[PDB]
Design a binder for this molecule. Structure first.
Ligand SMILES: Cc1ncc(COP(=O)(O)O)c(C[NH2+]CCCC[C@H](N)C(=O)O)c1O
Lengths: 421, 413
């Protein structure tokens, strides 16, 4: 297993060379998210090495994790920013992203947000007829021409239905039979639009690189037709959606190299800039959600590890029936009875669980427990549900040092919303 | 059909005689949750009326909605508070709630939260052996006796695996463990939780009948038991199909005479039934698109402000706020937000007229487990909250979250 979070022979969990027990003891006894900064570097360098010889933008999907320190680090390594909202663009500019490496996607881009997009000069995809009319009005208000990409549905349908974005009947991209309508409209707005490319995103947790190859071939047919109607196209955006190993049992998964190798010769043969939009595959595997065990109990013949963390800070398992690996931070006295636990949070409800049916040694009270691979769509999807206030974030750097990269939310951060009313 | 949000003859949606269209013009052009403060009042008065002549606590789940102004209004009317965390307890005390009308539930009550619970004189429902030991240690740290209730398990489990019952083997152990800790624990009653949505009043009656036999035996064994906490909500008509639903009167009519015969104080938990149908999530239509077989109304609101339909497969009624132009196509729509995954939907297969851009659209019955679960996914910052008063006036009960709120987490880091 290649992974930044490793259980020594001793039975201690480490993040790089630092013992998680040790960090747990130097921080507030409430849940926290812990990152390896080095694993962030390693994840980008795999894509950068994969894209050698291809003119390319690596678009970090900011939706996956919006920690300002993490954006600042990805941006220093030459990363681009993919953006689904105006606040995401705003954060991308404070992080110091180059606007000509930013791409603004979405199926409901507001006029106020398209105006910011236009004045800053970012790429803007085109998802619908109403989107186009909005991007046109945005250009008028901003007085800047807008580099657009047609987001096109390739009609390519094997992934959780809540993260399937390329399929027939998703809310994403234009109709295929209506491509000509978009090309005619763009040519009718030479002041306001400059068509520079085609965009697709197929979904998330994809583990089958064939679907990227089959997609890229359909996208090159459309770029070839667009080029022949006299449009100057520089860019193909195949998006993100590359999966990672959530199961921690040595599974061999498609690398960034495997993914680029499927479209390398087709892209090079058309002298296209490739835009990739990885979120999960850049950030997910760099991070544990660190909990304390509260107690252990039994309803009839299921068994329960009750932890301080919950669906408030980490909703992915409940929301998608997703597996994230669970294991203890410190070694157990070996007279404990290894049996099958459901791992649940302090909220009394059936959706408040972080994993089901997990063979583990019975933990003592106050024992560290982690959920692995919680760098993506975990903190970013977090609520204050049951007033479990959002956790702090720490990372481990090259030198073995521990730095807080996000203040913990307090109960006072809830009262701020009612001051003076 | 009967509701605080009604379409009139003029084809406009009203909230206690105020047009939602005129409210939308007063507030910022972004999604917002809108409540009828009077429907909150009616819903509570219905329980209060059903509980008259019965010693009782109407226990409101702060879990379902933790707006301070709404907590203070429910407290002003004699409402109790059901708590699942330290912070919810801190907030019940701020909102002026009576600690003799607070109960603290949960499978993971931290030691530190129980200390606060013990200092403040709130009831504690006991979940497990590790919960009891936690409670005793909370007593020794606080220096305060903790009033506790023991679990009773009814017949509800659809799964199928001393003088009580085959499903209540451990209760005697719990009584003896409580008797062994007199300075630290005082048993004051018995709790149990039924299905999330009670449809049949008979399931309440039967749970009550069972727990009264247990409390009789608990009283025979030398304990001073005063309280019966039967947690369970009545159903909400989420389809506005005008269905058959039992009223609070019908429910409490089933236990009234047995509870009076024993002089028990009945703690009911109607949190959902109290706030759910008082509230609309109000949106602006961004635009209408189509992909193959499906049509979409795209709104400004999202799974970031309202995850319930995505997370629980949940139907909530949707309709436009104002009349449509005559030419507008009536046709099936999914209603979706702008967040970049297919989980971001508020409703599916909804026969609506085709809204113009900027048109008001509501998701109904967004009172419970909606704002309380809001996130900042896609940095969609959390919406402000408004209510209509008795007089028809519009008052803000929560400030909108701003981007600088996200930025404050990184200050000096
Ligand atoms: C247009 C667009 N580009 C890139 C991405 C990033 O995808 P990934 O992180 O590389 O997989 C997206 C993302 N979209 C939706 C996926 C939701 C995931 C869900 N919260 C989960 O399973 O946790 C995109 O839309």
């Amino acid at each position: 297993f290649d992974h930044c979070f490793k259980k020594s022979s001793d039975g201690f969990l480490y993040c790089e060379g630092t013992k998680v027990q040790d960090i747990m003891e130097t921080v507030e006894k409430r849940p926290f998210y812990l990152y390896s900064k080095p694993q962030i570097t390693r994840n980008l360098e795999a894509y950068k090495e994969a894209l050698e010889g291809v003119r390319s933008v690596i678009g970090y999907a900011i939706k996956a994790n919006n920690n300002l320190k993490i954006l600042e680090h990805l941006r220093s390594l030459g990363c681009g920013a993919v953006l689904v909202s105006g606040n995401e663009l705003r954060l991308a500019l404070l992080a110091g992203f180059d606007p000509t490496k930013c791409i603004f996607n979405g199926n409901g881009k507001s006029l106020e947000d398209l105006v910011l997009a236009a004045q800053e000069g970012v790429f803007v995809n085109v998802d619908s007829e109403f989107d186009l009319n909005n991007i046109v009005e945005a250009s008028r208000i901003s007085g800047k021409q807008v580099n657009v990409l047609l987001r096109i549905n390739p009609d390519v349908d094997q992934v959780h239905p809540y993260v399937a974005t390329g399929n027939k009947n998703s809310k994403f991209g234009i109709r295929n039979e209506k491509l000509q309508w978009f090309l005619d409209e763009v040519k009718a707005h030479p002041k306001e639009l400059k068509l520079v490319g085609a965009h697709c995103h197929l979904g998330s947790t994809i583990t089958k690189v064939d679907i990227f190859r089959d997609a890229a071939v359909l996208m090159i047919e459309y770029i070839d037709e667009i080029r022949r109607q006299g449009f100057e196209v520089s860019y193909l955006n195949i998006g993100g959606g590359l999966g990672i190993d959530y199961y921690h049992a040595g599974a061999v998964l498609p690398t960034p190299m495997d993914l680029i190798n499927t479209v390398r010769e087709l892209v090079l043969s058309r002298d296209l800039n490739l835009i990739i939009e990885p979120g999960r595959s850049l950030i997910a595997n760099t991070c544990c959600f660190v909990n304390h065990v509260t107690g252990v109990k039994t309803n009839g013949t299921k068994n329960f590890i009750v932890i301080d963390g919950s669906m408030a800070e980490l909703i992915r398992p409940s929301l998608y029936d997703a597996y994230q690996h669970i294991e203890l931070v410190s070694p157990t006295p070996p007279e404990a009875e290894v049996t099958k636990f459901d791992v649940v949070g302090p909220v009394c409800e059936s959706a408040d669980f972080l994993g089901k049916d997990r063979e583990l040694p019975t933990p003592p009270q106050g024992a560290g427990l982690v959920v692995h691979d919680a760098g993506a769509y975990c903190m970013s999807m977090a609520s204050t549900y049951n007033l479990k206030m959002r956790p702090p974030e720490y990372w481990v750097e090259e030198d073995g040092s521990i730095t807080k990269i996000r203040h913990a939310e307090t109960f006072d951060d809830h009262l701020r919303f009612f001051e003076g009313l």
